Amino acid sequence: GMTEYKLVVVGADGVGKSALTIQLIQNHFVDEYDPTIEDSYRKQVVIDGETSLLDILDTAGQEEYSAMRDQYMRTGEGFLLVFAINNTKSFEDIHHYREQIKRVKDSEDVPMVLVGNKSDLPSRTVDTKQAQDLARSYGIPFIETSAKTRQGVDDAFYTLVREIRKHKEK
Ligand SMILES: *[C@@H](CC(=O)O)C(=O)N1[C@@H]2CC[C@H]1CN(c1nc(OCC34CCCN3CCC4)nc3c(F)c(-c4cccc5cccc(C#C)c45)ncc13)C2
Ligand SMILES: Nc1nc2c(ncn2[C@@H]2O[C@H](COP(=O)(O)OP(=O)(O)O)[C@@H](O)[C@H]2O)c(=O)[nH]1
Ligand SMILES: [Mg+2]
């Protein structure tokens, strides 16, 4: 069989959510992608030998808190918390996005992976150990990625699928 996974990519504007998503869907780097458009994208892959359909919601748009948007976000089975390693403010915002996921999911156990993107850039301001400590505080995996080179991209999405699998087994 194939298993479908609804993944949601969240994080501050400009961190590479769309670039990561399009790397997964299309296997190359799209540097200027519709900064204002929120869409979902589907891709069949194979993860640990299991055919997997990834349905990826690339978030964007206005900050809105409503019953309708909560219920749409609630359909995510797992979430990528993305910041950029040259952008300390995006790192500081991670806690807010995690907070919102727990609320709409109404569970302390939501599959999540912390993603530090833009690892190809030399101007690093977020130390890998600091991001690891944040991930430890949440009990989730941390993966460094470059949507530009594709390093870490499959690991980030596939690790999230493995976290969802753990959750579904309960
Ligand atoms: C900006 C587009 C542009 O103008 O260039 C854009 O696409 N954004 C911005 C950040 C991400 C994306 C969507 N909006 C947004 N911003 C959030 O936080 C922004 C800050 C900064 C000002 C105050 N605000 C609090 C600290 C950070 N947060 C969210 C947000 F939480 C959601 C959302 C809403 C309801 C439920 C949710 C459940 C799970 C996850 C998310 C997410 C993400 C939820 N939607 C947008 C958002 C501005
Ligand atoms: N060097 C580098 N640039 C990136 C990377 N990911 C995204 N970008 C650039 O960062 C900017 C924002 O990317 P985007 O995908 O729109 O982020 P989003 O707002 O979170 O959807 C764009 O100019 C991208 O070309 C990366 O891994 N490396
Ligand atoms: Mg985008």
Numbering used by the authors: 0 to 169
The authors write:
We prepared (RS)-G12Di-1 (1) as a racemate by coupling (±)-β-carboxyl-β-propiolactone, also known as malolactone, to the bicyclic piperazine group of a Switch-II Pocket (S-IIP) ligand scaffold using the carbonyl bridge design. The covalent modification of Asp12 by (RS)-G12Di-1 stabilized both K-Ras-G12D•GDP and K-Ras-G12D•GppNHp toward thermal denaturation (ΔTm = +10.3 °C and +2.5 °C, respectively). To better understand the covalent reaction in the S-IIP of KRAS (G12D) between (RS)-G12Di-1 and Asp12, we solved a 1.7-Å crystal structure of the K-Ras-G12D•GDP•(RS)-G12Di-1 adduct. We observed (RS)-G12Di-1 in the S-IIP pocket adopting a conformation similar to that seen for K-Ras-G12C inhibitors, with clear electron density for the covalent ester bond between Asp12 and the compound as well as the free carboxyl group resulting from the ring opening. Because we obtained the co-crystal using racemic (RS)-G12Di-1, this S stereochemistry could in theory result from an SN2 attack on the β-carbon of R enantiomer of G12Di-1 or an attack on the carbonyl of the S enantiomer of G12Di-1 followed by an acyl transfer. To distinguish between these two possibilities, we prepared pure R and S enantiomers of a structural analog. Furthermore, we observed the same R » S Cα-enantioselectivity (that is, C2 in malolactone system) in the context of K-Ras-G12D labeling across a panel of strain-release electrophiles such as epoxides and aziridines that can only react via an SN2 mechanism. Such enantioselectivity favoring a direct SN2 ring-opening mechanism aligns with literature observations with β-lactones.
K-Ras is the most commonly mutated oncogene in human cancer. However, covalent inhibition of G12D, the most frequent K-Ras mutation particularly prevalent in pancreatic ductal adenocarcinoma, has remained elusive due to the lack of aspartate-targeting chemistry. Here we present a set of malolactone-based electrophiles that exploit ring strain to crosslink K-Ras-G12D at the mutant aspartate to form stable covalent complexes. In this Article, we report an electrophile that alkylates the mutant aspartate in K-Ras-G12D in both GDP- and GTP-bound states, blocks effector interactions and inhibits the growth of K-Ras-G12D-driven cell lines.
